[PDB]
Design a protein around this nucleic acid. Sequence first.
RNA 1: AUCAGACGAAAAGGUGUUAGUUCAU
RNA 2: UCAUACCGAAGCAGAAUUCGGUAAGCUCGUCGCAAUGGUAAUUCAACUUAGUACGAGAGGAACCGUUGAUUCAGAUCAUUGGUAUUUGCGGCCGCGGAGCUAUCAUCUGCCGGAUAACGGCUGAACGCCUCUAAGCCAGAAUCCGUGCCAGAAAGCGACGAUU
RNA 3: AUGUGGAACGGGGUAUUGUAGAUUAAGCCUUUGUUCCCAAGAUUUG
Lengths: 91, 57, 91, 188, 76, 332
Amino acid sequence: ASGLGLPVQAIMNCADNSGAKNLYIASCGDIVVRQRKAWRRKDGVYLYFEDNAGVIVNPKGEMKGSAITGPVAKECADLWPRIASNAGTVV
Amino acid sequence: QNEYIEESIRKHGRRFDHEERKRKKAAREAHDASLYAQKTRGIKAKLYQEKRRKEKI
Amino acid sequence: HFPININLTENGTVVEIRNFLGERITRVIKCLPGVTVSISSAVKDEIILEGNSLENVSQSAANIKQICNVRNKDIRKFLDGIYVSERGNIE
Amino acid sequence: ALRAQFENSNEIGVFSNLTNSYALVALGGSENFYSVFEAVPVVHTTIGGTRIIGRLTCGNRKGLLVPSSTTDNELQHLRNSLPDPVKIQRVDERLSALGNIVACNDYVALVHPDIERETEEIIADVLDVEVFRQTVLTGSYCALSNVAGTINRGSDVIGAGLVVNDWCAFAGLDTTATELAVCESIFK
Amino acid sequence: MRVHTCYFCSGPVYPGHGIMFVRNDSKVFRFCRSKCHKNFKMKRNPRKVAWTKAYRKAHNVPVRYDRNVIATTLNA
Amino acid sequence: HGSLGFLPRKRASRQRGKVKAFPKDDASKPVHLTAFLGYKAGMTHIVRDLDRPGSKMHKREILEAVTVIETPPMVVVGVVGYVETPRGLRSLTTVWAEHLSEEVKRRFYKNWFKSKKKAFTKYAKKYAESTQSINRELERIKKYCSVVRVLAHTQIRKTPLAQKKAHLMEIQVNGGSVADKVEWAREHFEKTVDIKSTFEQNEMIDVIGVTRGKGNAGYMHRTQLNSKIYRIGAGDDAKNASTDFDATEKRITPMGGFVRYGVVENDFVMLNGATPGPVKRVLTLRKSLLTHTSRKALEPVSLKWIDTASKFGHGRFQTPAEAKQFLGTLKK
RNA sequence: AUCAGACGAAAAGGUGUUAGUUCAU
RNA sequence: UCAUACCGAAGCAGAAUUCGGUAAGCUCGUCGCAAUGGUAAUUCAACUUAGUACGAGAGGAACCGUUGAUUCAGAUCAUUGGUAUUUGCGGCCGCGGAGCUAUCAUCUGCCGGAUAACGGCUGAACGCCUCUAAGCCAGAAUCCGUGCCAGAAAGCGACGAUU
RNA sequence: AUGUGGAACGGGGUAUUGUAGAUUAAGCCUUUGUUCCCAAGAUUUG
């Protein structure tokens, strides 16, 4: 990382520049920009979407896509510096 | 440990019954040692016999 | 550090130990028949068990001591526990 | 900004949209951290599976304009839980991080630069503030309080790291103490 | 509990059934049937197919929850 | 073939499920029934909020792909007394009914029409002529017994099946005393039993049944485990498929009947997983041998919306009634 | 004997016995 | 017997764990009983627990729930993607309902004791002590039970009709 | 092996492909519809 709620290999929409309608994976900000399952934040919060919407991001923080649809997660943006460049607004 | 163990012993200490049990276990250790000498098997039996012979001599 | 809470049920037949070094699981020990366990008010955190069977009382004390056993902890450093203090004839 | 329990993550501000009268809370996570997030209507609802109100609700004491991407039914339940003066508006914008991209404080609504003027006005209308499109994580990077201190252990996301109420603020457990004091000075 | 409308077939979209697609422009498309999804994939014009209701025809504020409001909603 | 227990895998002879191990009973437990014969009405995905404290779907709407079982009422026309012996558990005597239905009489026979309908006729005479002999049999059962079961049979005519031999199988009358077991059996004699009374929609059910043969995979009697009930809908109930959230009236049967099964007009139950066997196959629903204490059984079930779309083909509407006004006026 | 017996690691060890002997008190 | 299940020992601060073993888990019927076998799962985790006992603190306790990742087996085609003799249909194609199939889908999947190692309590020999010689024990993915799978073609019982 | 008798079609429903039509259960449902046959034909059985 440059700074998994849903089932494994779930159909996750690549919100990043990959733009895949449903890419195999998931939790929002976990990479995975969004997911059907709620991402239980350590601060007691959740983060999810209607279905799995995990963007493409490498484990080292170098996200494959730099066009994250909507605002990327702030935890994801902090964990993945390219995800921060993918979407200026960090959720 | 060390300084911490000494400070704990001075402040709290240790169970006195454990020391009495340890002395009781020491007598059991001699009985266990005789049982162990009669329970060692295979290569351990030869090693135990060699250790016992060396200790006796 | 963490005080141990002792609860008596069925006229001392069942003894429940809670908050043992921060443990969140309560340990329940059932005394042998013919032995009654009560908390003496003369000495704080003192439990007195009286019965007609010496073997049953000794077995109950051993079970209580075995229940309150420190696991994966230093005996010299962590001295918290429950042990038999004194034993003798009631009369 | 008062440090609140947030476990490992220092972004308690993103989790809970603290406010004087619409202090939206965090749900579906750590019970102790969620209680600290609640501590001022505690809107602890996982709207659309997202309970990070401070990262998805652009507003303040007068009301929080949660993004329309979140579930309306859960938002309606959150609106019912929230006080009547607090209006839970729907932010139908591309930037789904209403709370994190828009620092819609009660006095001034620091909306996202990518958010349109109508979306900026929607956040401003909910919080009864003036719309101001600014960077595009204005809510995350800047505390929405009615000093640019790097909250969340020096992270550039100050508002996401430390929640800011209309008349107070709430930092995270691992948020920078100096930044939290700076946020307190900014929020008076 | 809201029933979505099909993007291609212009019909109700029940949960589970149908196919939901997300576009790169934050556009959500729902198909009532697999044929509608295939037609949408094939770039079929909704007005060019008489099966869809769109061709046949052309040829948000929340409120406080209350018992009376629920009764009014039930009547509507 | 990894599981050595099933090997050698051979097809089960009896299509009907066999309750090899009944749950343990006690006198404190009220007299009641565990196993209930049923049929695979079908299966349908239905949405439901997942109420489970500590879960990551806690109070979250999740679609539940589940299975619905046709469970017509249960008529009992016989009782068996099992006496424990050093060699094993032996049946002391069997007391069938004075009046047997045509369906259960069809079960005793291979054909109904060729025979002269002589099944249990002279027995029906001695039962009516001498009720005291039956009283002695019941008296013999009460004094010498530990296990009491009932010979209950299905009503095929209520079901939409070509089956006409009533499927019959022993069901232990769990609870109470042997005399109390017999008393309940005698009063419920020649009476139907509804599965809604047996299962409280929250109790623990391990469905057993025989699966579907494949051209020895198939016709295997396998006992499913951890399949909780969510709704025992009644056949006369038109609101069974319409819960509180989806108040729009609908029947569990998809329009045009279930897929390869037919229409449901009788009591049905609701459970998850997949049951051994395809649609319209005999299934047995019994109480769990072990008291499953996992939160999956403990959690209350508040079903959100039943689907009834045309699963056959591609059904875009769950009920015709709404689709009539939703879609334009038909040319007809 | 919790490997008897019955028909080489085998030397020995034994809180293992059986009979015990001898010597100390 | 690498890990793991079990514990014991070791500073093993806790985490991280190591080693030691234990441990091969990895007449015609109708309806029933179960002698005998195979085998209940199987491999491991994380969060909660507690973000704390320990620990200067940080990192991280037993137990609880949750998320699981599996293997294999059990299912079913509802969700799911196709295959598809509706080879059905519209223009050789464009595909395909049903049916079936899936680490291609959705899923479901054990038990209580005996004890092993292991440490005991009590109690002789050895007026005491003494896991032990009498006894009472604690303690295992092991074993046995248990559950499941069959059913003694040459097992059995109850019940029906009976040329 | 004389009646929800079944078996067949005539179908309806039905979705498919598909631009509404045809197949229309074939392992989709179902029939107040129709006819056919049959209160069987032999064998086995104390």
